[PDB]
Design a protein around this ligand. Sequence first.
Ligand SMILES: [Zn+2]
Lengths: 63, 158, 104, 53, 149, 183
Amino acid sequence: AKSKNSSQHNQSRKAHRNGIKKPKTQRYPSLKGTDPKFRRNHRHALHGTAKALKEFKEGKRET
Amino acid sequence: HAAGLRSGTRYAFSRGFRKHGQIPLSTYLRTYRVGDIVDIKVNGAVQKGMPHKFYHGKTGVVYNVTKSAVGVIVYKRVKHRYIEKRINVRIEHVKPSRSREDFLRRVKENAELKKKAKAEGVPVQLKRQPAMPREAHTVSIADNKPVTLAPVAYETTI
Amino acid sequence: VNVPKTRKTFCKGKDCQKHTLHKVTQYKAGKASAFAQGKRRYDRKQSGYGGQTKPVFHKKAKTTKKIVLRLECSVCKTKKQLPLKRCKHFELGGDKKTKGAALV
Amino acid sequence: AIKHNQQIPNNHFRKHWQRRVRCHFDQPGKKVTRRLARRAKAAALAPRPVDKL
Amino acid sequence: IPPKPRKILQLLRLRQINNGVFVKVTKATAEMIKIVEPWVAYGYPNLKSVRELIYKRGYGKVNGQRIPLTDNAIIEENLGKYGIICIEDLIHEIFTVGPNFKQAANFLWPFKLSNPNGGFRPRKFKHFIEGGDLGNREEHINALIRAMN
Amino acid sequence: GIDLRWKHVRSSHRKAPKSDNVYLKLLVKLYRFLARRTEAPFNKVVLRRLFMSRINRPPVSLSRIARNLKNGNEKKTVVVVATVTDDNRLLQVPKMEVAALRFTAKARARIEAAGGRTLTLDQLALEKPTGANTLLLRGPKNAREAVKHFGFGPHKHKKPYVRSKGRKFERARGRRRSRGFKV
RNA sequence: AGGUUUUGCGCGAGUGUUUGGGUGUAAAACCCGCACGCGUAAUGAAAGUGAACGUAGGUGAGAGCUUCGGCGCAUCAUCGA
RNA sequence: AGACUAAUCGAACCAUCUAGUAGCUGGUUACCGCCGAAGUUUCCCUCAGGAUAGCAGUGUCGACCUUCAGUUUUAUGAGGU
RNA sequence: UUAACUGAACGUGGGCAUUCGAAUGUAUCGACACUAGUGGGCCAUUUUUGGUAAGCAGAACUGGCGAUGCGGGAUGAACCG
RNA sequence: AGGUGUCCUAAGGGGGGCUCAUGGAGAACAGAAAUCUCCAGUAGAACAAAAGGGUAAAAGUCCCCUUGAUUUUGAUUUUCAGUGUGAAUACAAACCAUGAAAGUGUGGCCUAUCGAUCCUUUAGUCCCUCGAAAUUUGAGGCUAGAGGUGCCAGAAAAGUUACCACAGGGAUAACUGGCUUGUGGCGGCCAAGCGUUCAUAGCGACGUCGCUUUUUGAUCCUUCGAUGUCGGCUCUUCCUAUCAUACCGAAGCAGAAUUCGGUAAGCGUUGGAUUGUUCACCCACUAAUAGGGAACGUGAGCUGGGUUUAGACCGUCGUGAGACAG
Ligand SMILES: [Zn+2]
């Protein structure tokens, strides 16, 4: 026949049992969602600067 | 029993009393950069790019900037774990937050106190500390003499 | 609900790739040929003794259908399809509704 | 009734398989019989080889 | 016991009946105690009371072990870099709150006392002001430490 | 009562090998002695790795050691508490001096043909009892076929348990968007 | 019988003798090899195509080693090929 | 009269298929030691039942990383009882 | 992107610790693998819905019985210690 | 307390001029209300629809032009397992509308208005395959829509059993017992009034406070591997809310006959016609013919008239098997 419908009696205790784990923050957050126009430019910018560092060895005064 | 996108938002999304009509234009002149600390507060008069009722009052970190909107990161609490949500909100609903402003003010004085003290030759005592109990002192009764009190009798007022 | 007999919109043709004028028509279902794999497989399963071998639908609930417009390009004769919402009465090419002249 | 992440099973044990089970418990015994037959065949074909080109 | 006062007691290092610790009163701790008011009794110690508490029941925390303080060498090997080398330095730093009070008081294990001698009162789960035994008694906790320990 | 959250909580790391190799037990006795009576952390780290299991001691290869033999390391001692195998791609083997748990037949042959030395862990303790001028190496821990199935789910890009690979197996619905949805 | 994770063992870019043959103190023990199974290369419905610009890359951490300047295994995050 | 057809009839008796199926009752065999729950979320011709998440045990690995916290203080936001 | 080396992101180099920038605790840090039982609940202070009311039916935060003995309420699963 | 299975070529998009509902005062027929004019007028009007939010040189209203209700795939939000469906948000690459321009536009101002696998059918490239080799028909493939499941995460489906069967349930009804007392029964408090005059000899409106478990309800805690389920016959005992008997107090108590109250349960409380009756109504005697309990006392104490197995008849209902607290 009829029975109970809903409850939230033991949920808070069950959750706090072994902690509410907040995810760990990092140093370089991902670029998933940033605007594609900015993304295109950023890729080129890193490519160019990376070559300059290697060039700064055979060449000079790239600071 | 229903659950719509704006259920139970009768008093939250409303504008105030004697605050109707034109939106002050100084809102549209602020600028945002990634890493800024903003807080969400929705305006009822603008129906485009508005957030769900849960984020009305939360605080988050900008992670993206676009033509007329910013991307904010905030932390939601599902049962027994946290999740990070990424929402898109129009700048008409956002505002720069004064949560870290005290920290920035304090760090500047700390640097300059330390610099000045190193040149002079006295220790610093820079980090703050809670309110300690009071200290001893003396109170005079000259030209201030005590007045005697006493409880008052009962009487009906009506 | 009425729609004009012609309208101009995008044309995905290999040489148009731009807005062009289109003729509007309604979509009618195919004749349902008797050589499709489904029909051939069904006819073999139903032969011999055994009776009816696949379900037959009985519980209808919908009163309407969705209408889908067929478009035809005026230049390259490419075609497009666009669905609408549900509607009871539909007709294309009607006379534009007048304004402020109502009288009975 | 799946309960966890497993590989979807397909075991063709649904007829009366127990009535047709073959076990090879006579693997050495047969080998001995075959060798006896070869020697008898070799003795019958006295100076000739056993196989054929 | 409800979850909030439970956590506060765990942080105050009072996980057992008849445990005692020293704390320095500031605005950030005087009010914290007020939350657990229906579970503790506290007051102001004097010189005699702290003196006997350290001698008779003093134990120390060394590598996470309860080591009884029977020789001055134990204190120097663990609190020597702060300038504490003898029982008087420990007692002095605890009594007159000094710049190293924090380390001094975290060294000592929480004291385990026995039930008092002359009982408590008729009903001991009310407040001292009304006539009970728990809460803030000002200077009358010295008489309670004498009997309890 | 005492009102604690944890009590009688065991440890989490092995404290002795679960194998019963007689020669392995001798290593453990020797390095127990060394780690107890020295101050070089090299000895303690070697001791712990002697307990591990075969999936915690993945194999290393001549190419991986050859990688770390550059930029001023051509005269250090490589130590690998694991097996050491050959690589069919490294065409020319440099000059090395290796100390490993066990080599393969071809791996040992090729090292000694270039003009190096292969040791064992007992000889290593006899030559460099403090680990001076050594460098420790590990193998790739996540390079097992059984690790690509961990944490399977939607939007995870992991490997499923299927009895065969081809067109008819777990392609129709939920992968391509042309039949229902996608993951 | 067929799967899956974990523990011990042998060999290791290979691994697995026993369907079968040779032999035997005979249902034991010992030896032999052509094929074959799994792995070494993926992706598409398919015809098909098919993995190095760099000392096999850059950045932030990392046990250990170190001539004290630095080199940085496993693994985590991120931008690239 | 649903009556009678070997004390058996609103479908006789005998052997086999047959150890026929059951989301339903009943039972389930020596000792000690350590840890120790749920009756709740979503879906099902689902409501005496299953899958899914949660609560629990065991096996470990990375450091002994020095980080964390069912708490307080200080600064600053949101709410319509 | 801006009229523009004007900006935006990522960078090289340098400077600021003498004290790394509130309290308390750290009798318990992070990640992974495989799996058992459970999915009929009931009681109490405070808030509270239907009902004249009920040892009635239905909810929120917390604490208990179920899964737990001991001293008190003469007796009694939920009360006090 | 209510609402949805719709409606719209404009009721979508852009631009531009204007301000509303209503009140005051005037103008031939004209009046309460037709059309015109001035002043005031914070939204009290309008925005397709239920309710809430929002809007004043507009998001309303009138005028001009159009089809962003278009093409290619991705990211994010609410319900959530952070799966699917519905709906929504911010960009990217194209082609366009409008405006002098900045700009705005990816359907309806925001919160609802809808749909999987298999099969059929249409659109697209000029694409792959029919496995001995070619060419044209035919068929099978890849990408996007439509045909529908309202029990809406989606089986193809009429009744009866009073001839009945099996596995279970006190998780679930019909009887006792337990908590409650609305309804049922009984008793009080104040006093407008009746009683010839006079509130309380005898009564009591409008209101209000209680008691009991011999009526009936509400709940489903205990029993479904069973507690024998209406009434009558015989027999014992208990309660008092007293019909008669003992002794008394009041009266609108002259006598007689009566009415109200107290102490009191020791002692009695009937014979018959009709009905299975419990309940009821008549005849007659008597001092009187009071009300109740005990597992609605009482079936190894009786009887079997009724209900409540199987046979059978009638009336109404059903096409029929059959149904009826007739
Ligand atoms: Zn065209």
